[PDB]
Design a protein around this ligand. Structure first.
Ligand code: CLA
Ligand code: CLA
Ligand code: CLA
Ligand code: CLA
Ligand code: CLA
Ligand code: CLA
Ligand SMILES: CC(=O)O[C@H]1CC(C)(C)C(=C=C/C(C)=C/C=C/C(C)=C/C=C/C=C(C)/C=C/C=C(\C)C(=O)C[C@@]23O[C@]2(C)C[C@@H](O)CC3(C)C)[C@](C)(O)C1
Ligand SMILES: CC(=O)O[C@H]1CC(C)(C)C(=C=C/C(C)=C/C=C/C(C)=C/C=C/C=C(C)/C=C/C=C(\C)C(=O)C[C@@]23O[C@]2(C)C[C@@H](O)CC3(C)C)[C@](C)(O)C1
Ligand SMILES: CC(=O)O[C@H]1CC(C)(C)C(=C=C/C(C)=C/C=C/C(C)=C/C=C/C=C(C)/C=C/C=C(\C)C(=O)C[C@@]23O[C@]2(C)C[C@@H](O)CC3(C)C)[C@](C)(O)C1
Ligand code: KC2
Ligand SMILES: CC1=C(C#C/C(C)=C/C=C/C(C)=C/C=C/C=C(C)/C=C/C=C(C)/C=C/[C@@]23O[C@]2(C)C[C@@H](O)CC3(C)C)C(C)(C)C[C@H](O)C1
Lengths: 100, 188, 224, 209, 177
């Protein structure tokens, strides 16, 4: 709420452009996975070509999945901790481990 | 594993891979890593040289800089990093344009790309105009390449130290240091 | 070679041959092999010996007298002769140093050394091979060695005996000039001499006080 | 490259480049264009310094020339004392005119050459002035730069090579001499063992002061 | 076991009164020799510094932190009063340099001394000038023995100095301060 709203408008616009173009007609459940070559989560964004190894592909996929789930839980905790404290995360953490 | 170049007499004939950061990727990602390392090394060498030429000695270019805003090279006479956010407004853009042209031509006009079977770090012409990398033997060229790698690693550690010296309390246990912003003022 | 040093050290001193405890004669301290090291040590020793014989003779000569040519008395009659050298003109000292360095260049020049009939001392040549002065443009009569002959086709045994005598005599002369300089600097150092006196400033310092030069002649914050 | 260096000077030079400017590239043209350009630049610098050293001594001793050059003014051959200030005394037009003259001279130097020194020509070879096929001039202009009166054509090939080597070495000597003279002129203490000059002028490498 | 170190003054046999071998493997003996050699070198440096500072010595000409105002002469001729006279920045820089050097020593010797290798030898930080580059193998063993003997004498010396500082009139030749 403190930052200018035009910044949010432009950020949301850029994300809207990115995900409108990243799947040109592949929205909805019945149209996205019509091609039996689009594996889920593969938007083609691998510039550095980590995914041309094929031995660490499975461990990288599991690392991404587990880190994503952990980040979901973590961000939920951070948001609700800020809600119940009114302070940022590490200030609240310092107030937890204060003294008494 | 990499096993290509950069293992000097400091860790001793062996690759420095604690976390690895290799073998989790393909062969082209290693070449991309080496290209990024060499570009970082050269950029931080130039940044150490610029920090030395700005912070203490200050051998400013003779004349004016902006002609419109009245910005003088002598007027840029304080701070290592606040001097960047005083070089007009189009002056930054005409440097970033040169850098962008150089790198788009380095990635396009070099016929074998480094992620396809080429070499990370090549030259259209801009490197060695005077022939300082002349008839010297390939063992001498390998020695100078190793010296470049080690000097660049030291230069990256050097610019990392001189940035976060007056901003992170002690950190670097030395007495001197300059006060400025840690990172620059968001490009242009 | 490695084995020529023990036999020469036996030749110059039969009671203590191959004395060296320093363990440097095997060190290729330029990365140029054992033989180049031995040649470099031999050339350095012979050069130090010759410079010190000249220095000791000069100290004994100008420690009590001088040579009147033109105002060459005001410099000599000023403290010890080392202070006289330190009080000499800057152009004089520069000319002396550059003439000696030109002789060094002529000695080290491979083409000039090859014309005399051997190679560089680190490449198999005899350590100490100052070549003849036959190469420039306008004729120089006086050489450095044999300027007015005073030598002939002597025997190789006579040459070897003269070389050994020069080596050990130069060693004793280096000891002597070091003792004289130490007695001039610190009184009471050499206990067998108590007559030579007066300061030398820093004897290992050619440029001092009088010579201005383009900076970097900061004799302040010196050492002992 | 080794033959010219050895014939010029054997003791202190076998090849002697602390900077490897020979066998460089020089604008992606090749080694041969690099070598021809370097040799031509050396010969040109030596010739310019040889002429200019003679001019500097002939102006420092006091030998001016007669007739009232720029007769309405008096910025002429009585104005300055030090030769840098003498050349700075030319108001606007003398310097511009001699610059245009040298520009034409070097333009024809690079034009009339049958094969350029960067393409396989002999460096330092000034081409002859042409016939009456250049502009309104009726005869050949007699001046040239090499052999104006046909006198130097009697020298043989070995004499020509010896003269070229002597020209190169005397060129280097005159280059060192002029820089020594200007260093003595600007910075006292610099260049001892030479003739004593006075401290004057400013930015002698800058024409229009 | 056999190792190095054994020579005269012990009859050519291993000096070990109270156990402390036959519970040690090859790795433990390697660690014993590595700790002994590091202690020996540190103690040689310690006696060479203590003797030069305390007895005589021209000391280092300079200032040692122009900003703070401490001077080289003002540290004193004691050590426990002079080590405390060294500023905290200098202490931190010394300890950090030594720590970086030993982390490089642990990670840079290609066989570790407890995983093969030779104990007490680090290619880093040793002879840069080649003084021991091509000595004969029999001469190198004698100099290793000399290093061990001089080192053990040095450790005895350092603890003599420390004992005399903390407990006066101990080490009777050594004075009370
Ligand atoms: C971002 C700069 C950068 C990059 C891209 C590289 C890249 C590389 N280095 Mg390298 N290096 C660097 C900086 C860098 N280095 C610095 C600063 C030092 C000095 C400490 C070294 C010292 C060094 C040694 C001694 C060796 C290498 C080697 C290698 C190669 C194999 C390593 C690999 O696959 O993982 C590289 C992957 C990455 C760098 C991914 C990025 C991960 C980031 C940087 C983590 C962030 C760390 C943290 C913020 C740093 C804290 C500050 C720091 C000053 C301590 C590779 C080409 C080895 C080699 O050449 O093998 C033949 C080798 O032996 N490097
Ligand atoms: C902004 C454009 C740009 C950029 C990024 C470069 C980049 C480079 N130039 Mg360069 N150059 C440029 C424009 C540019 N040039 C122009 C317009 C000219 C005039 C025609 C030159 C003339 C030039 C020469 C003559 C040389 C370079 C060299 C270099 C390299 C080393 C730079 C260095 O270490 O500096 C760090 C700072 C210093 C070294 C200063 C210390 C004094 C580097 C690849 C050098 C090179 O390749 O080395 C062999 C070299 O010799 N350049
Ligand atoms: C690169 C060489 C060079 C340059 C730039 C000049 C430049 C100049 N000369 Mg000069 N001169 C030169 C070579 C040169 N000269 C040579 C080689 C000679 C001997 C023939 C002369 C003989 C000469 C005379 C006799 C006079 C000049 C004069 C002048 C000035 C008009 C101007 C400063 C005139 C002048 O202004 O003198 C003060 C003048 O009187 N010069
Ligand atoms: C802590 C330093 C240290 C270490 C690790 C070693 C290690 C070793 N020494 Mg050694 N030594 C030392 C100091 C040390 N030495 C000193 C200072 C002396 C001189 C007195 C000697 C004299 C000596 C001889 C004469 C011989 C050895 C031998 C050995 C080897 C076999 C002995 C063994 O298994 O014990 C290794 C384990 C330890 C030493 C652990 C230390 C046990 C306690 C903590 C020591 C307590 C001592 C006490 C506090 C000191 C008081 C003050 C003191 C000055 C009196 C082994 C490599 C033998 C050898 O070379 O065999 C091949 C041998 O013949 N040493
Ligand atoms: C255990 C090792 C040790 C420790 C902790 C100290 C600690 C100290 N010394 Mg000291 N010193 C040592 C060994 C040591 N010294 C040795 C071996 C010598 C003999 C050369 C000296 C000679 C010495 C002098 C002359 C002075 C000190 C001083 C000091 C004090 C100020 C810090 C300083 O400048 O140190 C400097 C310490 C060193 C330079 C020794 C470093 C030891 C490493 C192992 C050697 C690394 C250098 C290496 C050989 C490279 C040099 C190349 C060369 C051979 C060409 C401090 C209490 C000063 C003072 O005021 O004391 C009260 C002072 O003036 N020290
Ligand atoms: C000579 C090298 C040197 C030395 C002695 C120190 C010393 C120190 N650094 Mg440091 N540092 C250095 C180089 C050095 N730095 C470089 C090159 C960088 C990269 C820019 C940093 C970045 C850095 C950061 C970011 C921090 C320190 C901090 C510290 C302090 C605590 C470190 C600690 O807990 O020890 C750990 C020791 C071992 C693990 C062994 C300590 C005074 C911390 C600080 O500010 O404390 C005052 C801190 O947060 N350092
Ligand atoms: C805490 C403590 O106590 O320590 C502190 C101290 C201190 C100092 C503050 C610290 C720092 C900063 C450091 C160490 C910074 C280091 C910076 C560094 C290392 C900077 C390299 C530049 C190289 C360049 C520009 C190369 C140009 C090279 C050029 C232009 C060439 O062409 C090379 C050339 O070879 C060719 C190719 C051909 C040859 O024929 C000719 C030459 C030779 C010319 C640290 C890290 O905080 C540690
Ligand atoms: C035929 C042939 O082949 O050519 C011949 C012909 C010819 C022309 C003659 C030769 C020659 C050329 C020359 C000029 C050779 C010159 C040799 C020269 C000039 C040799 C100086 C030595 C100085 C010395 C030894 C030191 C004295 C040192 C002394 C006396 C001391 O230190 C003693 C002392 O320390 C105590 C013990 C205690 C101290 O408290 C006190 C002092 C310091 C006093 C040859 C080549 O030689 C041989
Ligand atoms: C540290 C210190 O001491 O300070 C200074 C002191 C000092 C003295 C000031 C110094 C100086 C200055 C120096 C060395 C200056 C050197 C100047 C120099 C060397 C100036 C060349 C002129 C050549 C000309 C004009 C040739 C014309 C051309 C002529 C005459 C020809 O036509 C040649 C000819 O071949 C043709 C083309 C055809 C042939 O058929 C006929 C001949 C052969 C006739 C120092 C030594 O550097 C150091
Ligand atoms: C990165 C390297 C670089 C290159 C290769 C390069 C090439 C050219 C060329 C092509 C031959 C021309 C013709 C040209 C001309 C001008 N440049 Mg350059 N320029 C570079 C760097 C800078 C910087 C850092 C600044 C700057 C400027 C100006 C001004 C402004 C004067 C005015 O405003 O009156 C003018 C006319 C300043 C600026 O624009 O300030 C508003 C300024 O600070 N330039 N510039
Ligand atoms: C010099 C100096 C300083 C310093 C210093 C430093 C770093 C000093 C370091 C000192 C150090 C590192 C001292 C180690 C001693 C280890 C000893 C003596 C081990 C003995 C071990 C012995 C005697 C073991 C003997 C036996 O084990 C044997 C061999 C066989 C067994 O069967 C039987 C027993 C157990 C009996 C200051 C203070 C920083 C400031 C000052 O200004 C300058």
């Amino acid at each position: 709420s403190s930052t200018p709203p035009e910044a949010l408008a432009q950020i949301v616009l850029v994300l809207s452009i990115i995900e409108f173009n990243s799947n040109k007609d592949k929205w909805t459940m019945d149209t996205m996975f019509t091609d039996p070559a689009r594996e889920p989560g593969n938007l083609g964004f691998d510039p550095l070509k980590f995914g041309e190894n094929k031995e660490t592909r499975e461990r990288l996929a599991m690392a991404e999945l587990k880190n994503g789930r952990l980040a979901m839980i973590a961000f939920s905790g951070m948001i609700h901790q800020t809600f119940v404290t009114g302070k940022p995360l590490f200030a609240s953490l310092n107030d937890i481990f204060s003294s008494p | 594993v990499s096993d290509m170049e950069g293992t000097g007499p400091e860790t001793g004939g062996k690759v420095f891979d604690p976390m690895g950061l290799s073998k989790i990727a393909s062969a082209e990602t290693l070449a991309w890593y080496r290209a990024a390392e060499l570009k970082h090394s050269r950029v931080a060498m130039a940044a150490v040289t610029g920090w030395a030429w700005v912070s203490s000695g200050g051998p400013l270019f003779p004349g004016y800089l902006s002609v419109e805003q009245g910005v003088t090279f002598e007027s840029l006479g304080r701070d290592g990093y606040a001097a960047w956010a005083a070089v007009p407004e189009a002056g930054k853009f005409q440097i970033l344009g040169v850098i962008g042209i150089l790198e788009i031509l380095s990635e396009s006009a070099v016929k074998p790309h480094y992620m396809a079977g080429g070499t990370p770090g090549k030259v259209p012409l801009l490197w060695d105009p005077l022939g300082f990398t002349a008839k010297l033997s390939p063992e001498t060229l390998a020695r100078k390449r190793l010296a470049e790698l080690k000097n660049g690693r030291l230069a990256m550690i050097g610019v990392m130290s001189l940035v976060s010296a007056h901003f992170i309390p002690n950190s670097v246990p030395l007495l001197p240091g300059s006060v400025x912003x840690x990172x620059x003022x968001x490009x242009x | 070679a490695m084995s020529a040093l023990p036999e020469l050290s036996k030749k110059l001193n039969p009671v203590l041959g191959y004395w060296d405890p320093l363990n440097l004669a095997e060190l290729n301290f330029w990365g140029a092999g054992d033989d180049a090291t031995v040649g470099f040590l031999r050339h350095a020793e012979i050069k130090h010996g010759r410079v010190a014989m000249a220095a000791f003779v000069g100290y004994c000569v100008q420690s009590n007298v001088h040579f009147p040519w033109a105002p060459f008395n005001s410099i000599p009659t000023n403290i010890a002769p080392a202070e006289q050298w330190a009080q000499l003109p800057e152009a004089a000292k520069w000319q002396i140093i550059l003439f000696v360095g030109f002789l060094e260049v002529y000695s080290e020049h491979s083409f000039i050394l090859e014309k005399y009939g051997q190679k560089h001392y680190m490449k198999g040549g005899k350590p100490g091979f100052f070549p003849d002065f036959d190469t420039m443009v306008h004729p120089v009569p006086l050489n450095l060695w044999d300027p007015l002959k005073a030598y002939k086709g002597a025997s190789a045994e006579r040459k070897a005996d003269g070389l050994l005598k020069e080596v050990n005599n130069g060693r004793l002369a280096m000891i002597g000039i070091m003792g004289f300089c130490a007695e001039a600097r610190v009184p009471g150092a050499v206990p067998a001499l108590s007559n030579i006196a007066h300061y030398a400033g820093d004897p290992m310092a050619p440029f001092a006080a009088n010579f201005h030069l383009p900076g970097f002649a900061s004799x302040x914050x010196x050492x002992x | 490259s080794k033959e010219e260096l050895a014939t010029a000077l054997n003791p202190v030079v076998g090849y002697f480049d602390p900077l490897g400017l020979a066998t460089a590239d020089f604008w992606s043209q090749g080694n041969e264009a690099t070598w021809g350009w370097l040799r031509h630049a050396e010969i040109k610098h030596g010739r310019v310094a040889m002429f200019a050293f003679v001019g500097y001594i002939a102006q420092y001793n006091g030998l001016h020339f007669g007739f009232p050059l720029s007769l309405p003014e008096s910025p002429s051959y009585a104005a300055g004392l030090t030769p840098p200030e003498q050349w700075d005394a030319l108001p606007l037009l003398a310097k511009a005119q001699i610059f245009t003259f040298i520009g034409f001279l070097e333009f024809w130097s690079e034009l009339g050459m049958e094969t350029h020194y960067m393409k396989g020509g002999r460096p330092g070879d000034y081409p002859d002035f042409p016939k009456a096929g250049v502009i309104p001039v009726t005869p050949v202009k007699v001046f040239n730069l090499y052999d104006p009166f046909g006198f130097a054509g009697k020298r043989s090939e070995e004499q020509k090579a010896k003269g070229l080597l002597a020209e190169i070495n005397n060129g280097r000597a005159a280059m060192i001499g002029i820089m020594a003279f200007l260093a003595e002129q600007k910075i006292p203490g610099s260049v001892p063992w030479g003739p004593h000059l006075k401290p004057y002028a400013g930015e002698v490498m800058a024409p229009f002061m």
